[PDB]
């Protein structure tokens with residue numbers, strides 16, 4: 289079915305847009321990713337059946353949580369596609385392969401719990417992964433699927449390029465740890481404001497990719513207001529489910545994960561846009577000017593959250 293899939297011509301036009309919402313096309317998501325892969329990395333990069341067998345196993349290894357699910361994975365892949373498409377030249381063929389795959393796998397087997405939870409309540413995953421707990425497990429899950437029968441989409445690569453792509457994927461997936469973003473953005477802004485940013489520099493390159501992975505991970509805030517508001521509901525549903533477990537252990541969770549504090553969501557978003565989102569897309573537009581619509585869309589939703597606080 290997925291091998292014999294064809295995208296409607298109307299989707300082909302609108303998929304290129306940054307603000308495009310995949311929500312309405314649930315059954316077309318696997319085939320949408322294939323489409324984006326072929327448009328970005330050509331039709332020959334992966335063996336069709338290997339890619340399709342890989343994709344459907346990635347889907348199966350996302351749980352049915354409120355936010356960090358198959359929908360989110362594909363939404364994050366699309367935003368990268370849009371970034372890559374508008375900045376195709378800056379990145380290598382192998383970087384475009386890995387980054388799209390990485391976005392699709394970046395929350396693989398996500399349990400609906402934060403890194404703080406797993407570490408604080410000694411979960412097995414926190415035992416073998418100290419910092420960036422779930423993120424390291426996501427890459428570990430990505431490699432596991434790659435090592436299943438007929439799933440190794442990179443099998444035809446040279447051992448050198450195989451090791452290169454995995455390290456781009458690894459770095460990309462670890463970068464989606466929002467704890468590491470704040471440091472990453474600070475340096476990248478520093479490298480821009482001084483004029484010392486250079487894409488020939490590998491470490492600078494990895495930092496730019498890291499920011500792109502954050503921009504993509506957060507992109508629900510760059511959609512049209514109704515889609516942004518709806519996804520926000522899915523986010524807090526996951527946080528509140530985690531806070532309930534902390535409450536069940538007597539421990540009061542942080543306001544963000546406390547459903548009893550749902551009143552302070554608009555204020556909480558207002559802070560998230562100011563502290564995280566706006567600075568994220570601001571620095572990204574300065575490095576990659578064609579990504580500007582992401583900042584515009586984020587700004588619009590910022591004023592919407594301001595509009596919600598004022599009672600309008």
Ligand SMILES: Cc1ncc(C)n2nc(CCc3nc(-c4ccccc4)cn3C)nc12
Nearest residue numbers: 506509523543544549550552553556557560
């Ligand atoms: C849109 C979005 N995309 C991605 C991510 C990771 N997130 N995370 C948030 C939570 C923001 C947030 N809500 C609160 C809060 C809410 C109610 C009561 C008290 C505090 C605080 N903060 C920071 N939203 C997003």
Ligand SMILES: [Mg+2]
Nearest residue numbers: 394395464465
């Ligand atoms: Mg994640």
Ligand SMILES: [Zn+2]
Nearest residue numbers: 360394395505
């Ligand atoms: Zn994510």
